[PDB]
Amino acid sequence: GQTWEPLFNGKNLKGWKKLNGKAEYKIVDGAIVGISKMGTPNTFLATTKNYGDFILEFDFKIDDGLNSGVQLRSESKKDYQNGRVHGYQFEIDPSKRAWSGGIYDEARRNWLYPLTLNPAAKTAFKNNAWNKARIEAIGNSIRTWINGVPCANIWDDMTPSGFIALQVHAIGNASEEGKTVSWKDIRICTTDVERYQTPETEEAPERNMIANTISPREAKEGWALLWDGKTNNGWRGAKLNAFPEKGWKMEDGILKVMKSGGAESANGGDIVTTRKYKNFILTVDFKITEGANSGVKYFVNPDLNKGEGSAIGCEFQILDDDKHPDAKLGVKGNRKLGSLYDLIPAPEKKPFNKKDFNTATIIVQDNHVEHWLNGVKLIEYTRNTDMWNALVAYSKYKNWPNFGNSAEGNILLQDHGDEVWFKNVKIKELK
Amino acid sequence: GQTWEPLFNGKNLKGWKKLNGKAEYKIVDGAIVGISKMGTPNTFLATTKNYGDFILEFDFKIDDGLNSGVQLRSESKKDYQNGRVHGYQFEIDPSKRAWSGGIYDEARRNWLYPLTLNPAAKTAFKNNAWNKARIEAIGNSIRTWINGVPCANIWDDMTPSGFIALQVHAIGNASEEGKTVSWKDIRICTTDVERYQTPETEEAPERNMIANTISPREAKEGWALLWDGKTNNGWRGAKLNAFPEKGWKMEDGILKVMKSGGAESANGGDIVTTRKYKNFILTVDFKITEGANSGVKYFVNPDLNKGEGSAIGCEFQILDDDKHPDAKLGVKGNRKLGSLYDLIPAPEKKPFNKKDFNTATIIVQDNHVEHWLNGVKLIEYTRNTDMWNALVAYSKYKNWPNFGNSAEGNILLQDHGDEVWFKNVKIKELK
Ligand code: NA
Ligand code: NA
Ligand code: NA
Ligand code: NA
């Protein structure tokens, strides 16, 4: 049957090495017990072997008010932060936050898969009890389970192989000196991994960490890239037959609208998809600069505006609400980030992290439309209704016949003369 | 079993008399054949007997481009239009309008039950073929069927007994000169009518013609009067504790708002229900004067406006679109008759008969609302939505917090200083 190799023999610490911190690892009833300390940094008991593709299993228990984790495909390099342990980590969190089984990129990218991405896994961890963990690291796929509950699922290629390590996190208050985290029955399967892998029917939804790519899961699910992360393929200027020769830069897997005078579509101009879409889920990652303005448009007719300014369509406003003057204009905030520009305001409380990339989601299912920001629904509307047409009649789009009522339209990225970054521009066409 | 009496014996015209016009009635293969003429008015072949409660059955055929009908409980009085045949008539309509089986009040009230009130019955009549008809006139209930399809259902007490007559409608163009209508197998049942009557499960929805009353059907169906047709009971001034002492008159079963300077709620002021309603079907019959303005409001809070003008609520606009200046003042006609005033425009083409009474219907089912005019849906909307709140934010109601979003409110009739008539103010409370 399945060939399992023990990583810990229940007797001694053979096959392990302590890195960074000076916390103790004692053996109590066939379990590795990591003991908290004071004045020492994070400690890691790392395997003396590197593992690429594997199925890892271990039992774990932790004192409340303590944080722990198990490093996967992790490294310690003398050239990077004096051998500080970095890489994927299976979170052990007994706090009310409840992100156990989540993936944290230790001393590197930080949170990759927090349990906000899969909230039903928050109930998996049993406080002050033994918990059974399973990790499946197969190619670029890293998946985690706690007590049979799927927790995290990331698609990433940064480190294909590295060590497994047990974390004893540095403590801050005196009230946690002898507080322990314990690991037992640590075993690994490295032979016939594909024979014993968990099916796609019993996993957490995947998060693809490899910018501007379509994972096998995303492909099976009907996703395609609108931007390939390298070329202007699939895009043209709204009023041009080809891509603009200025005002748009592509570098480091980021599609950047250039900073100019902040004027509307006066630099390189807006860019549109070279094809039309009907029903879809459109996802766009964006990062703004101070006082920046841009937007994601859909139901676009690139031939309507032959004059100055932005091409005609419905818009997912992108803005620095704190600085850009347009945020205070319009009616009851209908020009702030995430709004249906000049029509429907985004709520006052929205999950926006101005220092990082944010994800815009636009869903079109015939007449039904939704705007999401970082997995939270902002607005909901229905075109081809008495309400829609009446609302459009009061707006900036009052002169456009049958505005936002057509089945098909192009998707657009706006030039509002400010520096805005884009990546992971993907589409899932719907029935 | 059922006792049937033939109205036509198949051989001669014994039991019949020709009234008004001079068109011919010939017998062809056991059928009465009415022949169209020229220069003669409508002709009626009337039974020499009067019938009150009965079940009438006949087969009928008509040439296309011709109009006919069968008179029920009808009269011919020397004191009434010099013997002009008047009364209920079963319509025979081969035109695209398709109101065969509908009830028309010949030389009296005109259309009582057009097939606008039961559009599924429009398919019943077979062109250039024989059609079976059934009429059940039982007390105040007059119901009709064509080929087993229920067509019309009226509740009326104007004429409990009269003759049955076959109509040869006066023709205008020479091309109709020869054209005929035929009626065969004309039989009547006057004995044990209740034993053979069609159940309520197989009829057209009823229209009650008896002003300010609740028919047995309406009562069973949960309808009640908001105005009893005689007293101010159930009504008070919007800003008063009692009914206004001026500007509102009750006479002849009509509720009248008096003509003054055309100012908004400056005469007797608006009148409101002394009760609040939640979910309902509200019906109002109204008649306007030239350049008149009024309205039916719902979701009313009589305590919001303590100043000048109309009380606060959503409004079914009542207006003379042709003359009143406010018709040109909205956004894309949102202040014209039937509109949700200043919010949602009624369509450009609406069934409004400015010389007669018209029926306004307002349906509230929690957040969902509809406006109907004379059995035709005008607009439909949903409050407590992003679209609603955004649309309200652009309107005259932009300063009212949570406008039109409350479950309950009073129903109001507007004083807009013009002469407007009301009757049949009824409500069906919903779950
Ligand atoms: Na941790
Ligand atoms: Na914008
Ligand atoms: Na007729
Ligand atoms: Na009005």
Automatic annotation (TrEMBL), chains A, B:
Top-level taxon of the source organism: Bacteria
InterPro entries: AL/BT2_dom
Chain segments annotated as coiled-coil in the UniProt record: none
Keywords: Hydrolase, Signal
Domain 3-keto-alpha-glucoside-1,2-lyase/3-keto-2-hydroxy-glucal hydratase: 3-188, 222-428
Keyword Hydrolase: yes
The UniProt record lists the keyword Lipid metabolism: no
Protein name (record): Probable secreted glycosyl hydrolase
Pfam families cross-referenced by the UniProt entry: 3keto-disac_hyd
Listed GO MF terms: hydrolase activity
